[PDB]
Amino acid sequence: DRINTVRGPITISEAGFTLTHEHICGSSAGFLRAWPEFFGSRAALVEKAVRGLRRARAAGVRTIVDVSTFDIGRDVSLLAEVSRAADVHIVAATGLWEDPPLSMRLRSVEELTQFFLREIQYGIEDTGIRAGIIKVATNGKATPFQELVLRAAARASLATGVPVTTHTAASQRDGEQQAAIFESEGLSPSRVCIGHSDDTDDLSYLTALAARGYLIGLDGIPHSAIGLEDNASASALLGNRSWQTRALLIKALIDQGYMKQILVSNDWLFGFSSYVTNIMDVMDSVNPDGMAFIPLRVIPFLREKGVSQETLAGITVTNPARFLSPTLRA
Amino acid sequence: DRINTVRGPITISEAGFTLTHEHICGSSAGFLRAWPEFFGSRAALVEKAVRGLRRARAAGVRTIVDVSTFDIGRDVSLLAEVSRAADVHIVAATGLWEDPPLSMRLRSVEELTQFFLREIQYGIEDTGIRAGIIKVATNGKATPFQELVLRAAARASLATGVPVTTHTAASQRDGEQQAAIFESEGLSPSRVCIGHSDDTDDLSYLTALAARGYLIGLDGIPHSAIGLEDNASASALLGNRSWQTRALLIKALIDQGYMKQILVSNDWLFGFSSYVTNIMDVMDSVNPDGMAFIPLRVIPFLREKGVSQETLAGITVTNPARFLSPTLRA
Ligand SMILES: CCC1(C)CCCCC1
Ligand SMILES: CCC1(C)CCCCC1
Ligand SMILES: CC(C)OP(C)(=O)O
Ligand SMILES: CC(C)OP(C)(=O)O
Ligand SMILES: [Zn+2]
Ligand SMILES: [Zn+2]
Ligand SMILES: [Zn+2]
Ligand SMILES: [Zn+2]
Numbered sequence: 001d002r003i004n005t006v007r008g009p010i011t012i013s014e015a016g017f018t019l020t021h022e023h024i025c026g027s028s029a030g031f032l033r034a035w036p037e038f039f040g041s042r043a044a045l046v047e048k049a050v051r052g053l054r055r056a057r058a059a060g061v062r063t064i065v066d067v068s069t070f071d072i073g074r075d076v077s078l079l080a081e082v083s084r085a086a087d088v089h090i091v092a093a094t095g096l097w098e099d100p101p102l103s104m105r106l107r108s109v110e111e112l113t114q115f116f117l118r119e120i121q122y123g124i125e126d127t128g129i130r131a132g133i134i135k136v137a138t139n140g141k142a143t144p145f146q147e148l149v150l151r152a153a154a155r156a157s158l159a160t161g162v163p164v165t166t167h168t169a170a171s172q173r174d175g176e177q178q179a180a181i182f183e184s185e186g187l188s189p190s191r192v193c194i195g196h197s198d199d200t201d202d203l204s205y206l207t208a209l210a211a212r213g214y215l216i217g218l219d220g221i222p223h224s225a226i227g228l229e230d231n232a233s234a235s236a237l238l239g240n241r242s243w244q245t246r247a248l249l250i251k252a253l254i255d256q257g258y259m260k261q262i263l264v265s266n267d268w269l270f271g272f273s274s275y276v277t278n279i280m281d282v283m284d285s286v287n288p289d290g291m292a293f294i295p296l297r298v299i300p301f302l303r304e305k306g307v308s309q310e311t312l313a314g315i316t317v318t319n320p321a322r323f324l325s326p327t328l329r330a
Numbered sequence: 331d332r333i334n335t336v337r338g339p340i341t342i343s344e345a346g347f348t349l350t351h352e353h354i355c356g357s358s359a360g361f362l363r364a365w366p367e368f369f370g371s372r373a374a375l376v377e378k379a380v381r382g383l384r385r386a387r388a389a390g391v392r393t394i395v396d397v398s399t400f401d402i403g404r405d406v407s408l409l410a411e412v413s414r415a416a417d418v419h420i421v422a423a424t425g426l427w428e429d430p431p432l433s434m435r436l437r438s439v440e441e442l443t444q445f446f447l448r449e450i451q452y453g454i455e456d457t458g459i460r461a462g463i464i465k466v467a468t469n470g471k472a473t474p475f476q477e478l479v480l481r482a483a484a485r486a487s488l489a490t491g492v493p494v495t496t497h498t499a500a501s502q503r504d505g506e507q508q509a510a511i512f513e514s515e516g517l518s519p520s521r522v523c524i525g526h527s528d529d530t531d532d533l534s535y536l537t538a539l540a541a542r543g544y545l546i547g548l549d550g551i552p553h554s555a556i557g558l559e560d561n562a563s564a565s566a567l568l569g570n571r572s573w574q575t576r577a578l579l580i581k582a583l584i585d586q587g588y589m590k591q592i593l594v595s596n597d598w599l600f601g602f603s604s605y606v607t608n609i610m611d612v613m614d615s616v617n618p619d620g621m622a623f624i625p626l627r628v629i630p631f632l633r634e635k636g637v638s639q640e641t642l643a644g645i646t647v648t649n650p651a652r653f654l655s656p657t658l659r660a
């Protein structure tokens with residue numbers, strides 16, 4: 001009956017309209033503390049994030065799930081500061097993404113489970129802030145270490161009821177192997193979001209995951225380099241499918257009977273050091289609405305395509321609450 | 331005329347007997363803050379390091395150079411705490427070792443130079459503690475990113491006079507390429523230590539570096555898995571050459587006229603998370619003297635082999651002072 005946020009436990013009804021895959025800052029462990037000038041200053045990043053979350057809140061957002069891990073440079077005191085100033089709930093993450101350091105890559109499945117449980121059950125660092133989701137990643141076939149991470153995430157979820165959310169190379173159908181590993185540990189698909197699933201048009205892949213009870217993360221709707229002329233780095237990151245193409249996958253899965261299993265988000269950030277310099281400025285040019293893109297552009301677009309207000313409320317409010325609510329089977 | 335330590339500037343004469351390549355903790359950025367229980371506790375690691383540095387000090391050590399970078403999980407407040415409690419000067423490092431995260435790997439030569447200068451000229455994180463050495467690494471042919479690091483280290487040294495110290499795959503003769511890159515940026519060899527040079531017996535390699543004016547880091551003298559039975563992970567890390575074999579390289583370079591260019595150390599640690607679990611316990615079984623191994627075992631061994639007290643004082647006191655003393659040409 002409670003979800004952990006960076007400001008403490010909230011009731012399910014307090015979560016309201018929830019963006020399930022977002023970032024305050026996409027960075028690396030220790031980087032914001034060691035090199036804050038990369039972002040102008042820590043104060044400049046805070047001010048940018050507060051302004052952005054205030055615009056999201058004015059557009060109807062009440063909660064974001066910051067799926068930044070240890071290795072995305074998650075700074076839960078930064079999330080707490082921004083959450084307080086913007087009056088937007090932030091759920092923090094544990095887990096590991098695609099850039100673990102050696103001190104994490106050399107660990108066993110049991111050691112990793114201990115670390116994920118620490119962040120869920122005790123707190124992140126010395127902050128007492130507890131994660132309300134476990135984030136994991138593959139980019140194609142899982143590395144041996146990534147198989148241990150997915151198993152440890154499953155064990156941590158089985159002990160606590162906290163859900164798992166994933167990064168995929170969606171065009172490589174990674175969710176199939178992620179599902180296989182999770183299920184081998186006994187994890188209910190109802191506790192798992194297969195993310196970056198809007199990066200593919202393959203309905204045979206998306207419905208194979210949805211049919212076995214996975215939540216489908218259509219989480220990068222504004223990610224598009226269409227229109228950016230001669231920017232190879234932005235094209236490699238964002239792809240050349242339109243936001244409309246991505247958004248129509250929401251409608252596709254509704255039309256196949258999966259409205260209760262869809263989670264929608266922007267996968268936006270206010271700082272981004274783990275890619276090319278100045279990527280944040282390019283991304284802000286593409287999508288000046290930032291995290292407000294879902295409510296301001298995607299919801300009206302789907303309404304115009306014949307999706308009901310009730311169905312979209314179920315996707316943006318009911319599904320996130322059912323996902324985030326701790327349980328072994330949702 | 332001053333060397334920066336974790337407790338502030340010290341005079342050259344205050345450095346005294348100096349171990350030029352050591353670690354309080356060999357970890358990863360953010361790891362000790364996020365998972366202190368890996369080490370038992372932060373307090374247990376502090377107590378172990380203080381006990382070890384007190385034993386070194388009783389054996390005659392006055393200063394260690396902690397060559398832990400950002401990506402070795404350098405915690406300068408941990409170094410300051412241990413330095414104060416043990417009454418042993420600690421020089422901190424900037425630079426990057428072999429485990430940089432994406433937020434560092436995507437940076438340009440100019441950006442990296444800015445970051446290294448920040449840690450030398452302004453301070454590490456928000457601590458005001460300034461690095462007194464730049465640490466860099468290759469493991470065989472430099473990656474493209476490692477070429478940028480070595481160039482940025484050279485630029486940072488050329489601006490400040492702070493020396494550069496390296497990690498090599500010594501058996502792959504990496505110091506030849508490291509020298510080539512440093513010299514292409516205009517860096518004096520007198521400002522550079524080519525480290526882990528005791529990992530090779532190739533005198534053709536070691537004298538090629540020493541002849542052009544490089545300092546030679548014979549920095550892993552107690553690293554040996556001889557005697558450890560059936561421990562593949564310890565054998566891969568420590569090698570199967572004896573500490574005596576490593577120590578006799580000191581005598582070899584003295585006998586070739588390079589006594590002023592030799593730097594000796596243990597490359598010891600009090601915590602080690604970036605390798606297999608329990609490696610610290612295996613290493614402590616091999617070398618119970620820890621950082622005191624140089625003064626307690628190596629110095630007497632070299633005296634027994636006919637090296638003078640005066641020559642060994644020049645290696646352990648004069649050479650480190652000449653190396654660490656900021657200058658463009660030593
Ligand atoms: C029948 C699918 C539906 C019209 C349900 C109401 C929300 C919009 C989708
Ligand atoms: C001649 C080399 C030397 C005997 C000099 C004094 C110290 C030991 C080495
Ligand atoms: C910056 C990283 C976390 O972004 P992503 C694009 O994997 O969601
Ligand atoms: C733990 C790391 C820094 O050790 P090394 C063995 O490269 O000196
Ligand atoms: Zn991702
Ligand atoms: Zn993301
Ligand atoms: Zn090394
Ligand atoms: Zn070292």
